[PDB]
């Protein structure tokens, strides 16, 4: 049913499942824009495949050949199945557009599934090769931030009654290596390349004459060659090709809307904005240094992932509360922090 | 079965699922009127699609063409499938109303699913882009309110035997920025625009002549062109078009009933009523200031979400009990609060 | 449906299920490259089998024989089923390519399933015969590393206020025996051999004339032998053979892309890189000795499995944080370790 | 679908389910070679049955009879069903090979299921009659070994700062009785006998003429006896008999590969190797005596089950670590044990 496919592929959490494992607990490991680009680019061809053969849009078989009236039921079934299998054998069928449109019309679901798989591959490579590396580091950074917050408020609490910037040094180190960022821009670049190839294929397929689904087929190989009761050629038509073209144009539109999103995603430093650690600079136990910007290096990627997963950090939440209050400038940062009383 | 679709789409918790995650625990993050508008505007086209092809309302195929009596079974099947695929090819079919009604009749389920998806998109954008931002802030506000209540009753209990309005300052800050409110009114405005476009389309479709489902179809392209045994044209009829129109008028009625609800939702300040924090003004540890009204700013949105999710706050419940008792004015607020004894 | 098979075999965690048992908790026991090689080499033939008979690619029966027009419906059904069963009996059918292509065309799904099973067998033998042996040892090594880290920081903490390298001696012992490594390279070698045999078979099958699916069949054994109403021979065609060849070439391409991966996997010492225990050499309670390289011995296999599962080790994570910071060389290892304060 | 059966019967944990009960927690109670022999010998006939009627290998009905052209559709259906039911009634059908091949061709799935059930019976008898007896004893032995290890390290720890070999005496007692071992070799012997009978049957069935699936059938009992419009005899063919023979040869090959495995399993003392308790002899609280070898007695069976389930024993793991280190002979057993510090 149409509504079942709708639920399964947009309303269900299709490709939105969090990693079912206690190693990454609440950690996203895939940027929201990347998760939605993957969800679209993968589920849309699948949803379109499932629609192209919805039981109410499909009239029946995928091909019909119009055997003569003298032909029995089973002879007509043979003609249909023969021509269906004969869209490959170029000698049997004669089509005005060519044999390539026939191949594309028969194997359109396979090609869409191929595009879905190829578009799922880069997110899978990211989830397996580079997601744990960033997950461990991000979990460690969040733990260290919570610890420095607790120590700062404990020092402030003792005042109301070591000191090494380890996380800052770790991020300074991340500023050097660029392995994770080249992995990220490589998976994004393969996603963009596959999306553009899919756009090219879908634009070509939609550009077909729309009469290329009608091909002349001749069951005259083998012992049927010199047979006389069988006519020389049959007029076959590939049903559901109009549906294929109408769905291919939808896929092409969505994909050419998605390609600018991927291209923008490709520029990872430009997206690093609203410096997340700047809110921590108001802590005594934390050095006054953001030092996170301007590079095609893993530091910018970590900045993005921190900007995403930082809302889970309670210390960040309270510090941002104080920072927003500081916009008015009524009281003072350490006083409001001591008032806070939120170690964990 | 009809009853299965009924269960799935009204009696089941379709699109009423709470976010399956411990980040938002009992927090709604979608106003009840917005949740019901989404549920209706999305499930109604899906429920209608599923009804339009219920096994007891569908007689069989979606098209029937009445081949001549001389035609065999398979030749008639070819005529049916050809004309089904030929509602697209404008050269083959001749219809009094035009080819556009034929397109709309064949692809009515697809268009309804498209409307369902487009109507689901703004709630999805709200759930992903702006729901966590409001969720963290609302959870922090509820925690701070419980804390101030506990501190107030502890001070009162010590009397029977810091002091910074942090949440008030946070809300004062929210009064300034308007990012969340423009996100909210933007998703609501896109919902209204898509609902109005759906109303326009459904009113047009229902306005079709009701004989536009009968079209004359000619299987005479290719080698069949100069064939003589095949008649010049066939009288095809698109079954289940009357069902499509009867369901389109239902969808249009429900949508023109839903559009005023969305328009009213669009006026977020007007809906901010029954000042929820006013009940907290009777606490000594809480400054005597509501300061939440009159603006197209995120403060009004936070007021709505607080009015919704505030029933989960135990301190709010007890304070509202005292406030309602105060209507009689028998005793006194601090005495009844000390009697209360409900820290958590 | 195509999309259902897509989900089940690429988007679902097919053959990615962690061992459902508390004996191995978070331990991989299968290298990521080996897990992906198994997933591909097993799920691809299964996914291809499921595609070759997707309800929208299949026109109907797998064989059609074109009985004469005088034949009744049931007589034509008999001819179809007889020839289907007669691709085996070499006396009945006469084919230009031979009877072997006919056998291969009828039993192509069985042969692909056979290849899937044979390719699943070596990973199963590894999971049952050699996975627990390495699992117990790896869990013990991780526990001992956490213990030595805790003891080192406790000694450092006492300074701020036994001693036997047991794990080093255990690994030195592993350096001697080679049972696990010969088991590993044997399962990998059988995987490579079966992949190469599958490549050979698929390249042969795809090389078939593409007209070998058309065979002449004669229902003239038994009492039908001297019967006259039945014609001498029927022109049968095996539908879905073009689909079989198009899928066999896909399987062959993926398999010849997979074979270099298996060959590279076969060289286990070469893959032992980024010495994982080198990060532990900065501990006083740990002897300054890596001693893990250069051999076709179980030590290299344990090095690979440690490199994989070591991210679960918290002590390793903190030590790698200190080691990366040491790249700048600002402070000192023991001071930063004492600052660390992460016993568990 | 083929791939569904593949998953269910090889890739799923079919007949690999651990006993769903807290009485045996992590205890195997079935030797790995016995578990795999059972899995193969049971799932292979089931997987073959499911394949023999895969929807893409089955052309349709299991029998086709070729009624005359004058026969109506329902008369031909009657002939087919009559001959299908008439492979039993020996008077009606005349076959060159005999009626026994016809019986075997009709009831091949039943015979394979019968073999699967009979091969599942001995493992079931072992799981119910003799598995709890060995489970309680093995759990007690593991608990006693952990206890003696704890007591030995506690005595060693007190030195760094009763005494009855109960488990040794228990095993000495097991050395006497042979009930469990005769139960084990009896279930293995019945498994071997049933496997050999299945090999004999499958080798016979595969040896059929391959034209025994074509039998002449005569619907001429009752009032049809002297009827004239019905022909004297019909040429029926049992479709899917070639598939049955091709699958029977596969089953026979796998079974004659499995029979040597069962025969080797039958020699339980020979398999008792790598004396597991020898690693415990380095404990002071444990007497220096293995005393486990050379007998057709329950002690050898317990040795096998201990060798299997001993990896769950933590004390055994640590002791084996020390024993492997002792190969180099650098330090000393009690010193390294005291260093160990792994009571539980
Ligand atoms: C620079 C990054 C570029 C990013 C491109 C991403 C494009 C997407 C491609 C889709 C891939 C499918 C998804 C599967 C991803 C999982 C594979 C994986 O994680 O491979 C890791 C593996 C490492 O090899 P291994 O011996 O395990 O050594 C590492 C630890 N010691 O990797 C290997 O080294 C195995 C294969 C390489 C061997 C050489 C090949 C021929 C010789
Ligand atoms: C991915 C998209 C693939 C589409 C593009 C393929 C490139 C084809 C370019 C060469 C075309 C070619 O050989 O010419 C035709 C033959 O094509 C053929 O007969 C080749 C067939 C093309 C293969 C397409 C089949 C798709 C299969 C994918 C399934 C994947 C499954 C994944 C699970 C000749 O004919 P003509 O038209 O010139 O004749 C009229 C005279 N000019
Ligand atoms: C979006 C649609 C953008 C493209 C649609 C028009 C393209 C130009 C050709 C249209 C001609 C037409 O209507 O006749 C056939 C059907 O077209 C069509 O199918 C045109 C309407 C298609 C409806 C698509 C609805 C888009 C919804 C997106 C939501 C996300 C053309 O058929 P052809 O393409 O074979 O002729 C290729 C030759 N110019
Ligand atoms: C969304 C609602 C879309 C409906 C409105 C579409 C705008 C069409 C306006 C132009 C109409 C047009 O081109 O005129 C007809 C051709 O239409 C055509 O042949 C174009 C076909 C219109 C596309 C509708 C197909 C719906 C596909 C949506 C599927 C989405 C799937 C999502 C999962 C000519 O004919 P005539 O009537 O003038 O002839 C008698 C002489 N005047
Ligand atoms: C309340 C909504 C009522 C809508 C009815 C207004 C249209 C009246 C048109 C004539 C009445 C009739 O029976 O003829 C067909 C409409 O019937 C119908 O289709 C009327 C069926 C009423 C369905 C509404 C029942 C449930 C409403 C809400 C449920 C919750 C015409 O057919 P046509 O529209 O093709 O010809 C275009 C002609 N103007
Ligand atoms: C694995 C891949 C297996 C394919 C390779 C099999 C080796 C066959 C080599 C010998 C061929 C042979 O005997 O020659 C033909 C007979 O073949 C035959 O009739 C033998 C049939 C070959 C067996 C293939 C059936 C596959 C069954 C696998 C199912 C597994 C299920 C697992 C769950 C004669 O004919 P001709 O062509 O020479 O005649 C024209 C004159 N030269
Ligand atoms: C990249 C792999 C490309 C493989 C194609 C090489 C074979 C070329 C043979 C002629 C091309 C053609 O269209 O004719 C048929 C092959 O088409 C085909 O079957 C070509 C279809 C291409 C399928 C590959 C698309 C996806 C590849 C990987 C996806 C991930 C011949 O048919 P025949 O082989 O029976 O005659 C044996 C003749 N040499
Ligand atoms: C287990 C494997 C069983 C196969 C071996 C059965 C032994 C039969 C030996 C006697 C054969 C016999 O009586 O001779 C035929 C009658 O057989 C018959 O008509 C007896 C039928 C044999 C029974 C096989 C049916 C299998 C049922 C098992 C289902 C189990 C279900 C479990 C859930 C005569 O004929 P002829 O060939 O001599 O005529 C040509 C002249 N010589
Ligand atoms: C390896 C096992 C090979 C078994 C083959 C030995 C029998 C050879 C008989 C002639 C070969 C042939 O193609 O003819 C049919 C057997 O084919 C077949 O049935 C051969 C198909 C081979 C299937 C084995 C492939 C997978 C084996 C294990 C997979 C794991 C004869 O038919 P008939 O036996 O009725 O006539 C009785 C005649 N002696
Ligand atoms: C990502 C964006 C740019 C994609 C836009 C669609 C493009 C790729 C499509 C739309 C129209 C298409 C063209 C339409 C017709 C023809 C003529 C044919 O003989 C060769 C292919 C060719 C030349 C097509 C190539 C692909 C094409 C240019
Ligand atoms: C939200 C509310 C206002 C929706 C009410 C339904 C509206 C949009 C419907 C109801 C009747 C419809 C009209 C009925 C008939 C025609 C004539 C046709 O040649 C062009 C479209 C046109 C002019 C329709 C346009 C859409 C229409 C005005
Ligand atoms: C792993 C790589 C090398 C596999 C490449 C595919 C190989 C195995 C394929 C591709 C073309 C195939 C050949 C194509 C045609 C023939 C002629 C035939 O009468 C015998 C088999 C033979 C000779 C095939 C043998 C297998 C073959 C060589
Ligand atoms: C476990 C191993 C030894 C099994 C090997 C298969 C054996 C049991 C098979 C293979 C060939 C078979 C023989 C083939 C043909 C005949 C002739 C027939 O008139 C009586 C049965 C008899 C004599 C079969 C008996 C069983 C048989 C010997
Ligand atoms: C069919 O008859 C024609 C007559 O020209 C002949 O050329 C051809 O070889 C024949 N084919 C068969 C299958 O007999
Ligand atoms: C069909 O016959 C007509 C006769 O006028 C001719 O014009 C047309 O080209 C023919 N078409 C085919 C397919 O032969
Ligand atoms: C069929 O008739 C032919 C005539 O030559 C004869 O040789 C053969 O034995 C007959 N077969 C049967 C089944 O009667
Ligand atoms: C059928 O007719 C024959 C003629 O010989 C006779 O012997 C037989 O008894 C009849 N059977 C029935 C059912 O009338």
């Amino acid at each position: 049913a149409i509504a079942q496919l709708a639920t399964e592929y947009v309303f269900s959490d299709f490709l939105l499942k969090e990693p079912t494992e206690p190693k990454f607990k609440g950690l996203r490991l895939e940027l929201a824009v990347d998760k939605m680009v993957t969800c679209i680019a993968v589920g849309l061809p699948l949803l379109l495949i499932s629609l192209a053969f919805a039981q109410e849009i499909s009239i029946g078989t995928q091909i019909s050949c119009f055997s003569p009236s003298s032909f029995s039921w089973r002879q007509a079934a043979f003609v249909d199945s023969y021509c269906w299998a004969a869209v490959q054998q170029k000698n049997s069928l004669q089509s005005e557009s060519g044999n390539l449109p026939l191949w594309l019309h028969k194997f359109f679901p396979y090609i869409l599934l191929l595009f879905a798989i190829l578009l799922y591959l880069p997110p899978l490579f990211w989830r397996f090769a580079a997601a744990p590396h960033i997950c461990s580091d991000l979990k460690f950074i969040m733990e260290e931030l919570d610890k420095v917050y607790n120590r700062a408020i404990k020092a402030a609490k003792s005042a109301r009654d070591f000191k090494y910037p380890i996380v800052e040094q770790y991020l300074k180190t991340k500023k050097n290596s660029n392995n994770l960022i080249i992995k990220y821009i490589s998976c994004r670049l393969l996603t963009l390349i596959i999306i553009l190839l899919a756009c090219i294929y879908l634009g070509y397929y939609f550009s077909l004459s729309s009469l290329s689904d009608e091909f002349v087929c001749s069951i005259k190989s083998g012992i049927l060659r010199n047979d006389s009761t069988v006519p020389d050629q049959f007029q076959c038509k590939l049903i559901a090709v109009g549906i294929f073209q109408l769905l291919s144009v939808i896929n092409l539109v969505v994909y050419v809307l998605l390609a600018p999103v991927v291209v923008y995603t490709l520029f990872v430093p430009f997206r690093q904005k609203t410096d997340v650690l700047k809110v921590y600079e108001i802590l005594p136990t934390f050095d006054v240094l953001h030092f996170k910007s301007e590079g095609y290096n893993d530091l910018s990627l970590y900045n993005l992932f921190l900007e995403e997963n930082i809302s889970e950090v309670k210390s960040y939440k309270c510090l941002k509360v104080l920072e927003n209050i500081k916009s008015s400038g009524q009281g003072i940062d350490p006083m409001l922090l001591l008032t806070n009383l939120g170690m964990i």
Side-chain angles (χ1 to χ4, degrees), chain A residues 258-271 276:
Chain A
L258 208 60
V261 180
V262 174
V263 168
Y264 156 77
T265 287
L266 203 70
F267 298 113
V268 56
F270 197 98
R271 314 156 58 196
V276 60

Side-chain angles (χ1 to χ4, degrees), chain A residues 279-284 286 295-297 299:
Chain A
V279 76
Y280 277 76
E281 310 298 326
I282 66 170
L283 293 185
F286 194 80
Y296 278 148
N297 50 10
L299 176 57

